[PDB]
Structures are given as C-alpha cells and as structure tokens.
Amino acid sequence: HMAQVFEECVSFINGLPRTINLPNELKLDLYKYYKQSTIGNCNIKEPSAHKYIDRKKYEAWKSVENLNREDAQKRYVDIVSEIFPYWQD
C-alpha cells in the first residue's frame, strides 16, 4: 500500500503554502527519498562539486543507493509524519 500513501504525501508536500519553509537538511532528506522512491538508484552524471547545491543533491541521492522503492517511500512518509502528523487527514 505504500505507493498510494507516498503519492498522497508528495501531493501534500507539493501543496504546502509557499510560505512554510523547512530547514535544508530536512529538505535534502525528503529530496533523496523522493528521488530513490520515484526513479530509483541515482541515474545522472556526477555534477561538478563547484555547483554546490546540485552536488549536495547528487550526494544525498547517491547515499540512498540500493534502498528499494517501498523502504524509500516509507522513510519519506515517516519524515513528513514527524512534522505534519495530520498530513493525510
């Protein structure tokens, strides 16, 4: 059942008022699990470490290499639930 739960969680995040701002480490965690859930293992070329943020995103994603889709969705959903328990209401 994780796939549909995950889709809804993503929608909830996507819909957040453009006002709410989350800290970067949290955003990165959401990001890496989002990528690992949807695309799977990192599949792009390593960006230059000179492009700081793009590189940080790359390494975050790379760091969850080999986590299957279901565990990645669960981790994404657990992080969101931690901050927004009512997200699926």
Ligand X SMILES: CC(C)(COP(=O)(O)OP(=O)(O)OC[C@H]1O[C@@H](n2cnc3c(N)ncnc32)[C@H](O)[C@@H]1OP(=O)(O)O)[C@@H](O)C(=O)NCCC(=O)NCCS
Ligand Y SMILES: CCCCCCCCCCCCCC(=O)O
- Binding positions for CoA are 14, 31, 34-35, 57, 76
Q: Which of 31, 59, 74, 87 is close enough to bind ligand Y by CB under 6 A?
A: 31
From 1-9, 20-28, 36-44, 53-61, give the range in contact with Ni ion by CB under 5 A.
1-9
Distances (CA, A) of 74 to 23, 25, 52, 81: 20, 18, 28, 10
Q: What is the rounded CA–CA span in Å between residue 73 and residue 5?
A: 8
Q: Is 1 in the site for Ni ion (CB under 5 A)?
A: yes
Neighbours of 38 (CB within 10 A): 14
| Single-letter residue type at 12 | F
Rg (CA), the chain: 13
Q: Which of 3, 44, 53, 83 is close enough to bind ligand Y by CB under 6 A?
A: 53
Q: Is 4 in the site for Ni ion (CB under 5 A)?
A: no
Are 35 and 61 contacting, i.e. CB atoms less than 8 angstroms apart? yes
Q: How far is the CB of 20 from ligand X (least distance, A)?
A: 13
Q: Which does 81 bind (CB under 5 to 8 A by kind): ligand Y, Ni ion, ligand X, none?
A: none
